[PDB]
Amino acid sequence: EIDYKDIATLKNYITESGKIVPSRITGTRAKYQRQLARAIKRARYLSLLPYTDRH
């Protein structure tokens, strides 16, 4: 159901340094949390989100 193309959802789930916010802070379900992890890793290859705040 979740998808990697809606990057505005992915901007709310990352930091300024490109780090993935865990489900402890956001309070989301663990079913989506494994899916949100691989959905960012799809977008990490396609140059949609930066890895770190270095570059």
């Binding site: 193309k5 809606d6 990057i7 505005a8 799809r42 290859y45 396609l46 140059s47 949609l48 989100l49």
Partner: protein, 106 residues
């Protein structure tokens, strides 16, 4: 039959060669009973980080319903061509027909 989402980006200096690669790859798919669901041209798009010393990459999003004949040849001609700098395919759950959030905002 599998359901594929094919993501490939084109070198920005050959952005006019993109509609040639759209219809040449499609005729090999549809001849061997391959369906098609989504074909969206996005133009140039700013990169989150530089790749191959370039900026403003061309993006084309695809959805292809086809058997495993085209999955052998199309990934090799992506590595054979120098215009395609990144190639990525993925298996999806069903045949889907829905506009991307990039088209719905632009």
């Amino acid at each position: 039959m599998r359901h594929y989402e094919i993501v490939f980006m084109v070198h920005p200096d050959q952005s006019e060669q993109v509609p040639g690669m759209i219809e040449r790859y499609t005729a090999a798919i549809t001849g061997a009973e391959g369906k098609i669901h989504r074909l969206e041209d996005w133009g140039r798009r700013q990169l989150a980080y530089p790749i191959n010393k370039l900026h403003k990459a061309h993006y084309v999003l695809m959805n292809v319903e086809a058997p495993q004949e085209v999955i052998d040849e199309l990934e090799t001609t992506f590595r054979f061509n120098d215009a395609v700098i990144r190639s990525m395919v993925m298996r999806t759950k069903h045949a889907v027909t829905e506009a991307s959030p990039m088209v719905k905002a632009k």
